[PDB]
């Protein structure tokens, strides 16, 4: 079983007869959610020395991290009122960048591998971007399925087949990032286990058992890699959707 | 979005020879003048440990080292006392 | 796959919109504008 | 078995404070010093001029 | 239960679709991205057609996916 | 420390915490319904067995 | 010279001093939000953005 | 902006198809 | 009938290999029709319906393959 | 019960062809990144982005097929 | 167990074939690169690590399918 | 027993399907490098460590195949 | 309201406290014992199953 480093513990506990208060209480995804939270608060309470405008070394990075939200969503959506839709598009970043930091650390837990919160996420991001699009603009919303100055005879095929690829949109965005982060958290384990066995056997595979231990490392140099990405590629799809549902193409 | 851009543009050129006179030395008399209530620390346990690693020169990434054997050792005690 | 199917589904998905309104309250009110600040206090200074 | 993981994550560590901690710190010293160069010289040449 | 079982095959097989899927979508990034290296003023142009067609080789890469899940749940 | 601005967070996001609450509503039917099969219905950390009832057990 | 006979802690002034000299920096902010522009206008061209891309 | 028999040129016709489709 | 209800689910799979043409089919299309239209931009009104004529000629294999296998899956 | 698992693994074994349509993917994207940014050195900052956006979007479909051998492996 | 045990070779044989995907995904990566780097031999310090960051996402592709072959002999 | 056995001499046979990326893309490498040549003589000192580089990346991917040919073969 | 007089309460009633802490182990004991019985090892509500452990079930 390569795959128990994602088992969830319950820790502090609660429970009752009367009412099912089971939904809250503390578990190992609520107490590094709560380490998420502290670590973003430390990334901007104590940063900032004495509140001095010059700006020490650690708040160039938090400079630079808003610096690229900004002209990236100022890049998308673009229009009379981008700034109204940034900090969602900031804050979706933050999360997904600081939980697969803290994921990488070795005795530690993704956040972002469970699917089950990930799609809860992109569902919940997909209907705010339906109710807001049909509360802003009507009928007349359902003219995103038609792509432009078409043949008539085609464009009930080109309608059907662009609903299907409208509500795909839903599960898509969040299980772009969750088989990512699993694929990556699971591939990793399972060559630590087999090098370890590898290392096992005798005593000439100790000699010159560093070549796997490099390999090792270069997946891990490259985990970094696919996690930073994702969080980038999830705050540029989800720009690119309030493009689609705030103006109409 | 207009009058919107029209605001940004009005908030950086602002309103108003005399215009940088009366902005320049009414905003300089109250600059307090050299670098006075310095505070340059304080005692909560935590303000030491600003100082040390994140304010103004030290400003070094030893804090993720620290952090990050935190973890390590949290949940190194949390696998050993459930599966180990 | 066993261990992203528990009974932890309200769990996970309670802590987790919990943190999406804190972070966006959080962000949107305290964060980014404490660095705007920093910004139109850099650009006053430099109009002056 | 997590222990490889740990000990590639040490040396992951080593190659970051060798190679990567003293270019970011030249890169983070070389911001500040534009930063702080700018913010200076405009307000030392604009209040030198003060009909 | 032999059918409990050979449904588990076809939705193995039926994913083999997206096999298109992938190279298509990277053959429409790839023009878009030799046409806006060609032409540096089409971007704003041609860039509704890029995000069309991968909606479309999405949507038809899609269909083996709906075909896998319905084999796979129904 | 920190001064807190009032920046316009509910007349602008309220179809997201609309979506939120419709979705955290259909993901508890969803866990109901799935706390209930034939897998689980004797793991013991279920919130069955803090009120009331105990072990169908006839599979 | 007035304006050099104060002296200059511009590599330590506080945003909270700005804020006390200038409330007009506080309302530019706060009505810069409630409109919606996280833009700053010129400020770009002077200091680089130092964005990755 | 079609034009269907000479007719009133229609909205954007996507209601129509899946309301077609909707009752089946 | 175990036998025949079990091809009928891997005929089903099997059958939706072919739609991947129609996956590669819409790419290549829409990628001349972006090289086009990067050559000269005053072309786009003529070649652009003509594109979209390509899209749903090619798409008409893939929807055969697909219509094939719910016939097997369905019947 | 000895056939159920064993098909569960052999099309968990066959739902893993289709991510040699993500390598050729993610190749033919940072070519044309390549072959772009060599005949034009200040495309860069500007093609960068829809070179990500391709790049990881066309990853996608390869996810896909892998979450469905995560679920046909473990589910 | 002994038919679940030849199911897993069998399934560890057929995700063997997605390594072809990297394997032709490497080679488009830097045969891009050697195209570019001939028809502009000034931008090479722009455009290698862009090649080397192909190779590594295309790489990652490859080895999410070698990672099943192992899970299929062993665990 | 001969039913494993048998099945994982199949095994060891699917596998080595996919060095036949490796075999494309090694050449498709060492095209482009005379491709490049070609064009432009004086780089080759310098395009030349990065063809055999890419030789040395794309027989990596093959040679991952035939590892798990051997492994279905003497283990 | 009420006002607190130190009476002696630790120099007078001693081993009744220690024959409580005694009586307190020895209960301890005796309830793990006979948690672990064949009528009560099944029966949800036991805080093994809070830790680790689950359904030996065998009887």
């Known amino acids: 079983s390569p795959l128990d480093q994602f088992e969830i513990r319950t820790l502090f506990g609660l429970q009752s007869s009367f009412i099912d208060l089971s939904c809250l209480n503390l578990t190992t995804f609520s107490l590094y959610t709560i380490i998420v939270l502290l670590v973003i608060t430390s990334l901007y309470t104590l940063t900032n020395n004495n509140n001095k405008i010059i700006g020490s070394r650690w708040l160039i990075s938090q400079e630079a991290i808003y610096d690229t939200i900004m002209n990236m969503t100022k890049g998308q959506i673009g229009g009379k009122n981008w700034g109204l839709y940034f900090p969602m598009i900031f804050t979706l970043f933050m999360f997904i960048f600081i939980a697969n930091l803290i994921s990488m650390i070795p005795y530690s837990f993704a956040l972002s591998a469970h699917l089950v919160f990930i ?45 299907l690829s409208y509500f795909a949109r839903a599960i898509s965005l969040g299980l772009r990032l969750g088989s ?33 231990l490099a390999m090792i490392l270069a997946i891990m140099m490259l985990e970094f890699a696919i996690g930073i990405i994702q969080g980038y590629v999830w705050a540029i799809l989800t720009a690119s959707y309030l493009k689609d549902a705030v103006y109409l193409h | 979005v207009s009058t919107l851009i029209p605001p940004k543009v009005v908030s950086s050129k602002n309103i108003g020879p005399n215009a940088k006179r009366i902005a320049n ?41 620290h952090f990050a054997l935190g973890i390590i050792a949290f949940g190194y005690s949390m696998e050993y006392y459930f599966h180990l | ?45 430099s109009k002056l | 078995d997590e222990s490889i993981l740990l000990l590639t994550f040490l040396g992951f560590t ?15 010293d070389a911001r500040m010093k534009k930063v702080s160069d700018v913010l200076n010289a405009s307000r030392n040449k604009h209040v030198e001029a003060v009909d | 239960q032999l059918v409990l079982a050979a449904k588990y095959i076809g939705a193995g097989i039926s994913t083999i679709g997206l096999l298109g899927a992938g190279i298509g979508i990277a053959i429409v990034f790839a023009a878009l991205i ?3 290296s060609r032409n540096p003023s089409i971007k704003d142009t041609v860039f509704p057609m890029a995000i069309l067609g991968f909606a479309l080789s999405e949507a038809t890469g899609l269909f083996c996916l709906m075909v896998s899940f319905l084999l796979l749940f129904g | 420390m920190l001064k807190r601005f009032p920046t316009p967070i509910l007349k602008v996001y309220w179809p997201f915490f609309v979506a939120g609450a419709a979705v955290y509503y259909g993901m508890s039917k969803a866990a109901d319904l799935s706390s209930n099969t034939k897998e689980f219905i004797n793991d013991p950390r279920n919130p069955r067995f803090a009120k009331g009832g105990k072990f169908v057990e006839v599979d | 010279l007035d304006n050099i006979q104060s002296a200059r802690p511009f590599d330590e002034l506080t945003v909270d001093d700005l804020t006390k000299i200038k409330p007009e920096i506080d309302a530019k902010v706060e009505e810069m939000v409630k409109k919606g522009k996280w833009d700053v206008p010129g400020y770009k061209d002077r200091f680089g953005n130092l964005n990755v891309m | 902006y079609h034009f269907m028999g000479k007719a009133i040129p229609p909205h954007q016709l996507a209601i129509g198809t899946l309301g077609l489709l909707g009752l089946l």
């Not at chain 4, 190679?19 to 970011?24: D, Q, R």
């Open chain 1, 119 to 163: 799609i809860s996420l992109s569902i919940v991001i997909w209907l705010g971007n339906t109710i807001l699009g049909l509360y802003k603009h009507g009928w007349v919303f359902f003219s995103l399925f038609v792509p432009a100055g078409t043949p008539l005879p085609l464009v009930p095929l080109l309608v059907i087949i662009e609903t």
């Open chain 1, 180 to 212: 990512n982060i699993l694929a990556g958290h699971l591939l990793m384990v399972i060559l630590a286990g087999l090098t370890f066995n590898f290392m096992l056997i005798n005593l000439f595979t100790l000699v010159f058992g560093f070549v796997p």
């Open chain 2, 25 to 65: 030395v009414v905003h300089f008399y109250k600059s307090l003048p050299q670098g006075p209530a310095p505070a340059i620390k304080a005692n909560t346990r935590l303000a030491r440990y600003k100082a040390k690693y994140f304010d103004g020169d030290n400003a070094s990434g030893k804090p993720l080292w």
């Open chain 3, 1 to 45: 796959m066993p261990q992203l199917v528990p009974f932890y589904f309200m769990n996970q998905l309670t802590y987790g919109f919990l943190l999406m309104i804190t972070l966006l309250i959080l962000f949107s009110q305290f964060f980014l504008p404490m660095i705007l600040r920093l910004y139109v206090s850099r650009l006053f200074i």
């Open chain 4, 14 to 28: 080593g190659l970051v404070a060798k190679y990567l901690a003293p270019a970011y710190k030249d890169f983070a």
């Open chain 5, 34 to 36: 030799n046409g806006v």
